[PDB]
Paper text:
One such enzyme is 2-hydroxyacyl-CoA lyase/synthase (HACL/S), which catalyzes the reversible cleavage of 2-hydroxyacyl-CoA (2hcCoA) into formyl-CoA (fCoA) and an aldehyde or ketone. Originally identified in the mammalian α-oxidation pathway of 3-methyl-branched fatty acids, HACL/S has demonstrated remarkable catalytic reversibility, as it is capable of condensing fCoA with various substrates covering a wide range of aldehydes and ketones with different carbon chain lengths. All the enzymes are tetramers, specifically dimers of dimers (α2), where α2 dimer represents a catalytical unit. The three domains have specific functions: the N-terminal domain binds the pyrimidine of ThDP (PYR), the middle domain has a regulatory function (R) and binds ADP, and the C-terminal domain binds the pyrophosphoryl group (PP) of ThDP.
Residue numbers in the entry:
A (entry chain C), B (entry chain D): -2 to 482, 486 to 554
C (entry chain A): -2 to 481, 485 to 554
Write the structure that this text describes.
């Protein structure tokens, strides 16, 4: 009753944590409650944070980083002591490798029982630390504002990455006087740095000297929110560009300067590559033979000074923020006459290779034979994707062929297995996208193996009214199908699995497709259904991607 | 064709690894293939090792240690580089905490690409090391026999724990001359050590002197295979005994001397406790007030010398193997004639407390009201459990009430959340049990939250023809249900979920139960169905365990 | 004054720690004070603990483990925050590698400043944990008895190793009510375990079947205080034995059964090796060719089950305590007549190899040429070692030649570079020996390179009145000397250095020897000087050890 005297001078750690998270712009918290973190989730809701309770911490820790990428600010994963934290190490590793921020909040057993073999006693900061930019235990409740500020700043500033805060039971429930708690500042936007002017002019001088220049647009530019500057730069210079898998959409994928359909030739024959927030790691084949000229010249824009010149020396280094530096280049271009000319041999070679690759996939796209091939399946899928959708892609062939057949027109609208090649991100990423962008459609296209890692999160989607559209391409195995057996092959799964009945366990709509004639009607119904859906497509066991000169891994 | 000359002088790392695993007694390998470990799973199958391809490495790593516990030998988990290893860290942590052996075999990116940002390059030994007794990279294929011997020996000897072997791609595919490979010795049985004679006699002296003695039978005795010796020891001494959660069955749970129905009174009032392969950690409330007399005398049998006297000093230490040391006690008891007398006040107090607790839960067991309470549901489950079943239990109220309502009569026939309190072990444990003991029934009783962590492994079971019986107690939440919402509560799940439809996705039988009259017939049909099955029981949202003087955690 | 009322109800962390250490048998504490550990050292002295302030924590951490080995109980090293702990990691690593206990107590910056960049803030537990059996922070002063008990037990019990306790400034100075502090039990002697009777009898059966048996006596027997049992065993069986470098003295080095002077032959030709608390690591050349028969049979006695069969399979495993198991063997031998016969080809071969090696070094021992060779120097040094001395040996040729030329007659009386091959242990070990055994002479024979690592601790010895006798064999470099516009060679030091003047800096006696006629008188004067002393011997730059078939490392 409001009539009785109530003591209001004290606040506990759970409440201080919720307030600090909200002050620092955490709007989404993905996790699974239990000892000792129930009060944190409840307190978070009372501050208006959106708590999404999931079915495995592995998926929760993936959702938190996806939500961080999409919002531009660290979002939270909340897990119990012991195995809750160990399950969530999955997401720390993935966020580290992708340079994505996130905040993992792990409960811990009470400090006063350390050494005793307490329930879920664990060396949690020690376990998390090699996967984190920042990891620290909160030893007393009155320092929660200090630590939340420092952790969010460390995750968000510089090269982004994962931050971990350890929350012992006795700190969560510990109480301090309201007026005694020292405030913290609100973490603002990440600082942006610029390049020296001499480097800006040297970059432009290099571009003008090149006979076969190539701009590579990576997901660092998407994280930097540099899409306006990049679009202006490519329109001004008229340089050919190649998008990386999650750099897709920074330039619209239908831009006439994209070399995406001539990727192998463009990398092989360029005499100059301009990396925009993209690494010469495995996704770009290291900047080295056999995928590049041994003498390829490199302009490299990265926020990370230590990344400059990895594997292949950079002729011009542009260390700083992608948006700010491309802004400098656009400003410097306004005093120059040069642009990449409308007709060059390079342009003609690129066009010819695009035409050849188009010719290679044209009969597969047109083939209505059932069981379907991947290109036929994507002909129907691509036709149902609205231009403002968020696309989650996961699998081997399903994901890789999906990457070329599903264009993105706006940045940060594609989430996939990323720089770690992770299976297991799929429905976590979709749940994150639907929480952050409830006004936009969310379509996850998964292989049958991929779907098994996180498919139980469909119940999560249904519970929060998230109308995610899950499309499974089922070839009955990992990368390829398998004849019925003699033991089953290690890569074999269940070609006749009726995964769509999982939707029906949770109030969603399930659709099963074996024949090309069923596929359109199934997708139209799934898109129209007011709720989450699974379309389970039984595809050809031996369907494969377009032949190429080089294996993707090599 | 066998007609053409084939060079047979060379063998590769994958084949050496399969042969060494087979030599060392590894019979089960749970994993998910992909780069770079496909050759290892194929080679393992060629040597006759059973390969179980699962749906998430988290479950595979849990399956591996359950198989090790059941077989008495380290069994393998096989995972890909990068996130395959990070996902499997779950199983390493669980194995460390339960003193269970396992062998995790993690693929790695090729050594010659280290530093370059290779696909799934990761510091895998470093990440695994805090969770392992033994962790090492295999740097050259010709060292494979050496390392597999050493890792298996390290995991199995002494206090058991997890071993990790890192297998780089170029080691897996690297070839050596068969004749050149150094063989390794076959790892035998774990050494057993004995206590000094004076300690054996001091232990019997102390038991003779006690007014209220209590033997506590822990899962170390199950691991030691000490059940014959423990059974002879209790029959000879006639001492009251208490089983720990997975120590159930070492003594038959229906034994007249069990104090399991008077657990709180027995721990509170004992003047002497004899720990048999059981720790004074949280499961036994640390051996300290408020759950024990502050002056409780302790005899402590543990293989780990460092464990002796943790939290509560041991009056008599018995450091060595459970089977061997209880064997010494039985021998020394054939030269004394003491037994604990047939009539004592302690016996009378224990019996009256058991009778009071039976009366306390009898009305709930008998109550046929629907939605049902937990004790009612277990009345039908327990009446249908075969005496040789392997029971997997998982959840909070589901698991803990199932612990009291589901007796075990043989050792090593209960697998549950264990010393780490882990949600997520459920279907991986069930799959391991069906793999190891295909001629025994395997029944997993899970809460609805618990089922969500690993439920996709139902496809794994169906694919290998494992007729696991999954019984879900669904209260719509973690620990308790929740009314309709304002946001849904953090612990709420879906009370109306039709989880049994997941069975129908993979060719199993699904049964849905909301009324007590339905429960009997559904369980009968599920047990009789020649295949895996899910029985989804919608139980009362506020059903709870019997009241107790102390919280289980405190 | 005593007349004033004084509150006495409160005690601080520093005092609680000093009392707990004294309760647990810590008698010696080696360290360097500073923030925040000054109150710990003062409190320690108030409880009667001997505090030895050293000149570098590297040496202090080596002293602590040597004192632990000599006393049989963990002794303490006390260091400041940050670099104090980092400097002491040296000792942690050495203690792990040697299976020696020690307790490192590292001060830490105050918990309330964590995250702020406090003076010497550091992740101290994390840095120490890979080098420790046990490492924990003390988070509250009332837990100090609990943690000190647990750390001492973890260090001392089982296979011994290093323990680390982290002591934050606010825990050291924090106060609690005396009456409120929970006592901890006193850690007693390490538990001893026995082998099964079948293994005892199989060991004696194996020994009787061997044609060329060899018993190897390692420093695990010295740690176990098994010298009486081992001497009885060798006297009873008449088996040839070999001492390891710090196993010397467990058997007296002048025992007629020692194969010390025929080591390479004994290892090469033995058909059966009985390891007594010694590992097949590098010191015993792995139990493998080219140093052993490829079919050598092995009986292995180790406390560590996981060590059994490393590198070479064990035919008979004896897992348990060295004293207890050799006790079992001696007892089983009283029911047998068997002993190794007085005349066998094996004895004849051993004796001829011994005579051959004595003849090889006899002229070097007798050669009075100056500058002297190593064997000539040790002729005079060995003549002047009292039977009860503690010998510290450190260097390459100085240490290795000293090992064969300086016999020990009592166990635990030789301290040397050990299983890690460490330069830097010299004067810390000497200071530890002089603190623990002030009634025994302490003689450190060091190479000129070795001396430079720890030579400043001579001021520590002088300050505490420790009459350590430091003898430096100076060849002007690392392993060998060198001639004097080219740079100095990397191994070269100062052949004409006058190291003995360092004794004179600190009130000790310095002697300089270049001529063989000077050596006897200098050693006699140094031994008689009632204080610490340095005898600096300028030896031949090219003096070397006796030629051998095999390099010591290989
Ligand atoms: C490493 C990669 C960036 C390498 O890129 P590629 O696959 O070689 O190129 P993609 O951009 O996908 O294009 C594929 C080929 O199709 C051509 N292409 C692309 N778009 C088109 C269109 N629109 N029309 C016609 N042809 C096209 C393109 O030129 C390539 O051919 P060519 O020019 O002839 O080469 C990528 O494969 C990748 O990100 N893979 C993810 C791997 C992963 O994480 N797997 C999960 C674990 S698997 C291990 O267990
Ligand atoms: C820590 C614990 C070992 C503590 O044991 P308890 O729950 O207190 O006791 P249990 O053996 O389960 O018995 C419960 C109570 O029922 C009594 N009891 C036991 N058997 C019976 C029967 N057959 N009939 C009637 N009463 C019974 C017993 O004496 C206890 O009452 P009293 O004597 O009156 O106390 C256990 O709770 C546990 O392992 N929990 C796992 C927690 C976990 O991981 N959860 C997932 C996290 S949530
Ligand atoms: C690894 C070792 C145990 C290997 O032993 P060895 O040196 O081969 O044997 P030792 O016992 O020292 O004996 C040496 C040789 O002398 C013979 N020998 C032994 N005693 C005598 C006597 N009294 N008289 C004559 N000859 C003797 C013995 O049979 C050996 O010859 P043969 O029978 O003919 O072989 C040891 O070398 C060692 O511990 N080295 C430490 C290395 C180290 O840490 N250095 C400091 C770091 S170096 C920093 O890069
Ligand atoms: C955590 C983790 N574990 C395993 C892998 C290896 N990963 C590859 S990717 C397959 C998907 C192909 O199988 P799929 O989804 O059915 O797609 P498709 O090619 O058949 O169309 C596998 C399992 C991984 N990268 N990360
Ligand atoms: C890896 C991991 N993540 C989370 C937890 C917390 N875990 C609980 C232990 O505070 S147990 C509950 C299941 C209860 O929910 P349930 O299965 O529906 O059973 P029931 O009680 O409702 O009958 C939760 C989720 C955990 N231990 N380990
Ligand atoms: C911490 C550390 N650093 C270096 C080494 C290598 N260590 C060897 S041992 C030589 C001493 C030989 O030089 P010495 O004392 O003068 O003896 P001597 O053979 O010339 O007679 C060296 C320096 C080591 N083992 N550990
Ligand atoms: N604001 C920023 N400006 C420029 N570069 C950035 C910024 N934030 C992160 N980066 C960099 O972007 C790069 C992303 O590379 P990568 O993840 O390999 O992209 P992709 O997979 O698209 O090639 C990282 O090297 C990271 O340091
Ligand atoms: N062969 C063995 N003999 C005796 N004790 C063992 C053996 N193997 C393991 N142990 C010990 O068994 C104990 C198991 O304790 P715990 O997991 O706490 O049991 P519970 O959960 O049943 O109480 C561990 O302390 C472990 O060191
Ligand atoms: N009480 C004990 N009884 C038997 N062995 C022990 C005991 N304490 C330690 N040990 C063992 O003694 C061994 C010493 O081996 P090592 O240091 O290689 O000796 P050395 O250098 O003399 O050959 C270690 O393997 C250790 O586990
Ligand atoms: Mg597939
Ligand atoms: Mg529930
Ligand atoms: Mg020298």
């Amino acid at each position: 009753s409001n009539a009785m005297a109530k003591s209001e001078g004290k606040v506990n750690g759970a409440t201080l944590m919720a307030r600090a998270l909200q002050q620092q712009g955490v709007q989404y918290m993905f996790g699974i409650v239990g000892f000792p973190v129930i009060p944190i989730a409840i307190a978070a809701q009372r501050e208006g944070i959106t708590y999404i309770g999931m079915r495995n911490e592995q998926s929760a820790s993936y959702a938190a980083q996806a939500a961080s990428y999409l919002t531009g600010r660290p979002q939270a994963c909340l897990v119990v002591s012991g195995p809750g934290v160990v399950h969530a190490l999955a997401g720390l590793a993935n966020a580290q490798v992708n340079c994505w921020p996130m905040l993992l909040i792990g409960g811990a057993s009470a400090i006063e029982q350390n050494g005793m073999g307490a329930f879920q006693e664990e060396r949690q900061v020690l376990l998390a630390s090699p996967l984190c930019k920042y990891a620290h235990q909160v030893e007393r409740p009155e320092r929660i504002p200090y630590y939340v500020e420092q952790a969010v700043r460390s995750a968000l500033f510089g090269r982004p990455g994962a931050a971990y805060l350890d929350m012992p039971d006795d700190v969560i429930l510990g109480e301090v006087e309201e007026a005694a708690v020292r405030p913290a500042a609100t973490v603002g936007e990440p600082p942006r740095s610029l390049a020296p002017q001499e480097n800006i002019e040297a970059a432009l001088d290099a571009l003008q000297s090149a006979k076969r220049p190539l701009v590579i647009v990576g997901k660092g530019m998407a994280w930097s929110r540099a899409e306006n500057e990049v679009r202006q730069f490519i329109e001004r210079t008229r340089l050919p560009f190649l998008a990386t898998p999650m750099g897709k959409g920074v330039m619209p994928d239908d831009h006439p300067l994209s070399v995406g359909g001539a990727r192998s030739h463009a990398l092989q024959e360029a005499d100059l590559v301009f990396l925009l927030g993209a690494r010469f790691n495995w996704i770009l084949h290291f900047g080295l033979p056999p995928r590049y000229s041994k003498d390829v010249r490199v302009i490299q824009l990265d926020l990370s000074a230590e990344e400059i010149g990895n594997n292949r020396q950079a002729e011009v280094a542009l260390v700083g923020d992608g948006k700010a530096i491309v802004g400098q280049l656009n400003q410097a271009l306004s005093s120059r006459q040069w642009f990449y000319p409308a007709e060059t041999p390079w342009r003609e070679a690129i066009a010819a290779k695009i035409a050849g690759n188009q010719a290679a996939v044209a009969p597969m796209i047109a083939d209505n034979t059932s069981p379907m091939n991947y290109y036929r399946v994507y002909r129907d899928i691509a036709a149902r994707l609205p231009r403002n959708a968020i696309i989650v892609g996961e699998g081997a062939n399903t994901m890789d062929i999906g990457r070329t057949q599903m264009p993105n027109f706006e940045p940060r609208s594609r989430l996939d297995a990323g720089s770690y090649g992770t299976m297991g991100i799929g429905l976590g990423f979709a749940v994150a996208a639907a929480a952050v962008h409830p006004g936009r459609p969310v379509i996850a296209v998964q292989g049958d193996s991929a779907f098994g890692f996180s498919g139980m999160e469909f119940e999560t989607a249904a519970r929060y009214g998230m109308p995610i559209k899950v499309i499974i391409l089922n070839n009955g195995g990992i990368g390829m199908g398998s004849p019925a057996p003699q033991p089953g092959m290690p890569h074999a799964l269940s070609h006749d699995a009726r995964y769509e009945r999982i939707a029906e366990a949770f109030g969603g709509a399930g659709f099963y497709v074996t024949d090309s004639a069923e596929l359109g009607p199934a997708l139209d119904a799934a898109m129209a259904f007011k709720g989450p859906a699974i379309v389970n497509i039984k595809i050809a066991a031996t369907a494969d991607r377009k032949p190429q000169q080089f294996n993707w891994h090599g």
